[PDB]
Paper text:
Catalase (CATPO) from the thermophilic fungus S. thermophilum is a clade 2 enzyme consisting of four subunits, each with a molecular weight of 80 kDa. In addition to its primary catalase activity, it also has a minor phenol oxidase activity that is capable of oxidizing o-diphenolic and some p-diphenolic compounds in the absence of hydrogen peroxide. In large-subunit catalases the gate and small cavity are formed by Arg134, Glu484 (CATPO numbering) and a loop of four residues (Gln185, Ala186, Ala187 and Thr188 in CATPO). The highly conserved four-residue loop located directly above the hydrophobic lower part of the main channel in large-subunit catalases is thought to act as a gate allowing access of H2O2 to the lower part of the main channel, while reducing water access.
Author numbering:
A (entry chain D): 21 to 697
B (entry chain A): 20 to 697
C (entry chain C): 21 to 338
Write the structure that this text describes.
Amino acid sequence: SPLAAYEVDDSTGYLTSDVGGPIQDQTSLKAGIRGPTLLEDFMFRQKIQHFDHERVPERAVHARGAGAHGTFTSYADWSNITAASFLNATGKQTPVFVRFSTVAGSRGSADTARDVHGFATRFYTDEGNFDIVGNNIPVFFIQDAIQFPDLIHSVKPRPDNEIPQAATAHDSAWDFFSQQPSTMHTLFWAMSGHGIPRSYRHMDGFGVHTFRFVKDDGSSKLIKWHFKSRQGKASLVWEEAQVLSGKNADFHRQDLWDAIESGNGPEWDVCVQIVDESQAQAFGFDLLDPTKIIPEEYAPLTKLGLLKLDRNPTNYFAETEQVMFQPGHIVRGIDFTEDPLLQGRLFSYLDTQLNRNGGPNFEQLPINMPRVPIHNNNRDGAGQMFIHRNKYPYTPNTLNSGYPRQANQNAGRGFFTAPGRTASGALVREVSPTFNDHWSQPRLFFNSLTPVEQQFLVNAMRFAISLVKSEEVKKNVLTQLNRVSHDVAVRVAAAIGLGAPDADDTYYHNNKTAGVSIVGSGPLPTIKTLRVGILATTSESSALDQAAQLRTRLEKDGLVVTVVAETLREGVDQTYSTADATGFDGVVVVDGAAALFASTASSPLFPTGRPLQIFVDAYRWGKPVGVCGGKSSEVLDAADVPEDGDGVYSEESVDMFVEEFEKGLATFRFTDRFALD
Amino acid sequence: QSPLAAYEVDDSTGYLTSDVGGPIQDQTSLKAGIRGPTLLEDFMFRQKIQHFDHERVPERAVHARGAGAHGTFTSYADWSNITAASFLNATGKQTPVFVRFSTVAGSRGSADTARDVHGFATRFYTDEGNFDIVGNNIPVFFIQDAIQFPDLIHSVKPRPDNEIPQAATAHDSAWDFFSQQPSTMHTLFWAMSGHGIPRSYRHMDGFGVHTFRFVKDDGSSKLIKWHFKSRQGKASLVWEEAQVLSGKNADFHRQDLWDAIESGNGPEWDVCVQIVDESQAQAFGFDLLDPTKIIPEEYAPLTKLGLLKLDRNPTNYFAETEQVMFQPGHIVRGIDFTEDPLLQGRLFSYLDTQLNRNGGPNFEQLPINMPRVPIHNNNRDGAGQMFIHRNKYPYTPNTLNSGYPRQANQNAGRGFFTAPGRTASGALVREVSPTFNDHWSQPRLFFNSLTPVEQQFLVNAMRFAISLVKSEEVKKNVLTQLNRVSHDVAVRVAAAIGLGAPDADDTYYHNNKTAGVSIVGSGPLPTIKTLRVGILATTSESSALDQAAQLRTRLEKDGLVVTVVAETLREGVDQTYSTADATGFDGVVVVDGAAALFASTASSPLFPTGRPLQIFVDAYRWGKPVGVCGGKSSEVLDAADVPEDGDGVYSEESVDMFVEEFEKGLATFRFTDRFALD
Amino acid sequence: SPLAAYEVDDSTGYLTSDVGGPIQDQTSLKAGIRGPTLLEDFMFRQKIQHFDHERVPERAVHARGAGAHGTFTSYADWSNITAASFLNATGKQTPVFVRFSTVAGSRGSADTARDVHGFATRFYTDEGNFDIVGNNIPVFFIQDAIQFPDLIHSVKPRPDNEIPQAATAHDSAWDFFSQQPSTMHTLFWAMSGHGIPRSYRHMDGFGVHTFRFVKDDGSSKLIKWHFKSRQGKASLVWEEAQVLSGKNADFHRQDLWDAIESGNGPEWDVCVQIVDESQAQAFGFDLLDPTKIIPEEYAPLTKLGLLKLDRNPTNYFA
Ligand code: HEM
Ligand code: HEM
Ligand code: HEM
Ligand SMILES: [Ca+2]
Ligand SMILES: [Ca+2]
Ligand SMILES: [Ca+2]
Ligand SMILES: [Ca+2]
Ligand SMILES: [Ca+2]
Ligand SMILES: [Ca+2]
Ligand SMILES: [Ca+2]
């Protein structure tokens, strides 16, 4: 409804051309009933021309994504730290649109690739659109925007054959990573569970760069943006993510869409670290360096307000595909820093919309329009929608009484550059030596994961680097990993038949920081929307009765229940043929269905062994699993699952089963099922 | 104008903002120190300059030079008896219009008063969809098949090695094409007449050119020609006037239209048709599918359908005039195409060319292109998509959107439908109908139907144009074609270029004439409102200014645009001699108090030597009503070598008597006895 | 001939599609001799699509202009003041392309409007393309690039009716000039004969901005570019310019084209003023200010080499 003024209703009426002439569109005009098609058929040509021209260029990066409408609510009057109008009163509401994405894949690539993820937020503020174009990882691969095409060429498919679409699993990517050691920190994040988040709702957003908050009095503070998920942090496991990339390439957009439709619209606390201008070089690194975090121990998070996504788009193309974010969409109360990565982005996002939109009036697209008046002397250009009344669009003028008026620090609530900002020195294409430690923070991150988490990251690196054909690249990779951790280099090297180089302890240390572990972030604060697959059978009325009883008690607590059986009927959502363990956060077998789990079981209605495969996959990927009804050992023995296993449930009582199982869904993953080196 | 009103942006108050509503400045770049380099992070600089860098769109492939205005069409009757068309279905029914007038060959910025064919494109924003009649001021076209359009247009546009010259009809390639493609002769004769240099957009007619069909709700059809007949009357420039006006005021026609509308003198046309039976396609001595032919009015009279009035200027020229995208494909139920091969191919071109101009497929969403009725269709996405479509099942046939939108056809939904009587029979051919082969009779009919002096103006336009052709061989080929229309024309043209005309070839010669194609013959203007009177005065004689004031009052009440001219501006003086020229006026009056300025000793640092007399003598030589108000009128006329007995020369002591006579002169408009004949 | 590798010859042969299929292009394919045109007529659609898409956007400024090929010849080894390879040896030749232009008018506006004029030179150097994008007047209207759209909106036609095409003869232009006094120096040049030059060949070219010459040792000097006409300076008179705008809108492009075809290819001495970094504020104004000239009495011209235009284009558009 925030874009209701642009909506077109086709629930009634006769087909028209784009100029409102009623027409047909089902049969071409022909010279006789078996004749050739006539050039004078305007109905044909106008419809096919539109179809022919439907597609626009995909985004150069973050081509794969999904968006939703929502509201931002301020917790306070933040005048004391920023002039930003959207933050100036307790409870002040501002409409938002968010797009989540992967980075490397083209617009049809699977959601559950291993990748960095985007988290872009537009605030339609009463002083203009403000965009925070962030990622789910707080540090970037590179220290200077000029290097972005080198990064993205190296991670994107090899340009002779456009193979492979596995961003982190080919020679060219590891060549870049190993020759550009700045990459180590973001690389360690991408090789962790942060590279395969369970959903958009179960990851954070980060501005990455230091920005400024600027008060009306002109004073400034340095800030980092942190959008902290109220759903909690969760990952897939790789073995799961690969299958899910085939069974459901749309998994993350469907999870978000379903959460909003079910009234479970995801929430983030929008937070900042605030530090003084004097602390730019005080934390043992440069706040202008986007490869570095400020440990929460040095600067705590201040909660500014609530971000809630609660409305799906009406038309995906018009809203999600066409949304054009820019870090240059800035408001009074915010300013840039001399982060050489941020500095260059400001150019890129204004320029790239010419490519996507095919013309300069992209801010006039409904999704890009602000919610306040526009007063400027911008004119003409392809696709001009506005009819400007002012016939003297120049400053300075008298013929339009000197309107529009210049807005600045002192008049018209103008944007203004933080007036304490200076530059001094040579005009240089030189890197600050303050940027030169590429390895300490990667080690900080690694140090801050749990032992099983550390194993998962080593395993992601073993997987990816084992696919690199070049022996010289694999050696260069072990040289860089070794500068972060000798142990990581030895464990990765073991997988690929190379020796790790000798320990180089220059950057080694045992410092740790809170808030970067997924496994370590404890049970989820809510299980609403989590997916329970109930494996039943049509062959036993009592199996369906057990399933209906389990459904009622699970749905009461807001879980999404799928009853699976051989065929569809009342109370069965999916067939075994379409069901998979990647479809569920937990799997329950009703003991009336135990016959389906025998090695002997066979049906033309589903692939050999499908019922037991769903159970075994779910167990092996660490999910809560169990048998409800009391007769558990036929199913558990066929699955090779121990009855006494953590996150393995066997109860006769539906009530006791669900109370135990719901604890399992909160735990989310049972990490004792994964081997350690 | 719902879509146009909704998109209007008022900047009469407020602080400068970005396109996303963030208040900003735009006067100083952000720099690393007061004498420092400009910063990349200056988003205010880049958004403003990016917009500026992208302001321009491709000009139209043809008709690039033009001007537009809003108005209203009012039907005179319920025309159900001849057409299903909803805009014509009731007495007094009003439909908003937008019209764009144009030249053909010139680029943007080329002068209005080039010798050229002119566009007259009319959009009817009807209650059953937008209906465009994309016409010209000349009722016949150069060529008989749309596939030839790039050949014609390459030949008339500047030579592509050096892009010289801008003069469409005055270079080798144009005459090469005309002489090798004899279909061109009829349109060529029109463009070489006064129709090539109209006095204004308001003083020319509009023509559909092609035969179209009127289709009734019973499926029956008739063949029609569109004629928009000026209520201002037909009038031309003279060539030497046009050439000077091209330099003094390249915006003459757009300014004339703008000024007429602002003054409450919005131009009008009777929208008319010739209506003939399908059985008459080949009855009139030529093929109605041939766009090089008119139906003589003597064979098929004009029926007045309604009133076209232009009465509102655009708010933003670029957004409305430059972006308006006309299409003969914009047709409504009750109208149908014919198998005219020129029309047939147009239908493809205008849909395709808007992709070039707009840079994307959503050009019908621009406010000027939008309809005034709801749009229901399954067209989706594309660059610049401005709609948010609620229907998530945009396919036919569907159940998931309850089968909407519904198909519209002859039976239901007031669907467009092809005239059900239309058939095709025969081989699939790239062959020209032999019924199209007479390229010379109608050019001769047109030539025959002009007055003797009008024939001289046409001979003289060809003498001018053909004399600039460098190729002797192209000039000979031209005489060969002209000779097939009229031996006399070929003899008279040949004299100017030092060649002999070929021997008479009487195959296509005849003495038939037709009413309604002559300008010189069309009689006095039915109104003199908007016509321009230059009063030549002096600041050096209070009596000269009083005379000019008394004339101004007396002429302005009759709706004439009066310019008092003197050495310097003051109260009552609109213009200096320095900026004034005879091309700025329809009539020129000298007040006898100004007599002293019309001598040969003359001279002022405030205007070129001889300017005041040059304005009067140019006015006389170009056929305009000219006169002296005073009583020493005797004298000044002698200075100018202008005879007092002269038709359209005035000489009256009384202001009241001077004006009465002078105003008859303005209606006569041109005094053609001032032009030498062969 | 410097672009000979890209030339297409149609002095012989049979008509083909863009993919080399021999075709015809004079009659549409119809369902019978008096029939409607067929959609399957690919000869028609490929030809008319090309025609329909011939036009590109005109330049936002300097839309009206004309170009020619030529040669630049260095008079010396300029190592002493610049590392620039095209200046590194006596007699070193570099191909050039030059375009001359007005500023305000659209691409079919008369050459002889009163206006500033463009003089844009490309040196196709052995160390890359070097462009000097200059005007025939050495000073600009405005002191900051962010003001360009204000200047150009004010001098271009009024945007309600696109009237008038006379850059310097309407309210908005004079409103801008009177509110933005920086415009006075360029305005005086545009109101002199410099606003209506006799030809592109009878005007000079100016870089306008102070640039730097940088030696291979890293030392720098401040320079102004001055292209000095070997044909001499000449103007029209205004009344003449106005008539010529109607009688021959192509007058300057024709003058240039004819001079080249007659073997009178126009020449300029490419010159610089060279001053020290320390003199940025020494001449009574700031060298960073593009509304100011360095008087020749303060800094004489140095001749660097010869610019000669001697070859017309083959295809104007391309
Ligand atoms: C901190 C580093 C970065 C972050 C967090 C980031 C984030 C993002 C995100 C989230 C998107 C997708 C926005 C959407 O969903 O529509 C995006 C797109 C894009 N980014 Fe960045 N980015 C970063 C660095 C860069 C750099 C250094 C460049 C270029 C120099 C760049 C150029 C682009 C381009 C061209 C697009 C496509 C934008 C569009 O089509 O609208 N990014 N980025
Ligand atoms: C009876 C013959 C014709 C008439 C009366 C005619 C009339 C016109 C008019 C008045 C315009 C200007 C519309 C405006 O003001 O925006 C125009 C534009 C155009 N015409 Fe035609 N025309 C004719 C034949 C053709 C043919 C045969 C072709 C191509 C095969 C053609 C292609 C075009 C194109 C490409 C444009 C530019 C359209 C645009 O950019 O909107 N015309 N024509
Ligand atoms: C000393 C000041 C300037 C001079 C001498 C100058 C000169 C020129 C010339 C000669 C051209 C035409 C080049 C050609 O023949 O193709 C041109 C085009 C252009 N100028 Fe400038 N100019 C100046 C300042 C500016 C400024 C301040 C801006 C914008 C911030 C600007 C933007 C442009 C644009 C957009 C074009 C069209 C370029 C193209 O389409 O290729 N100019 N200028
Ligand atoms: Ca590779
Ligand atoms: Ca994990
Ligand atoms: Ca494009
Ligand atoms: Ca020629
Ligand atoms: Ca039909
Ligand atoms: Ca003005
Ligand atoms: Ca002079």
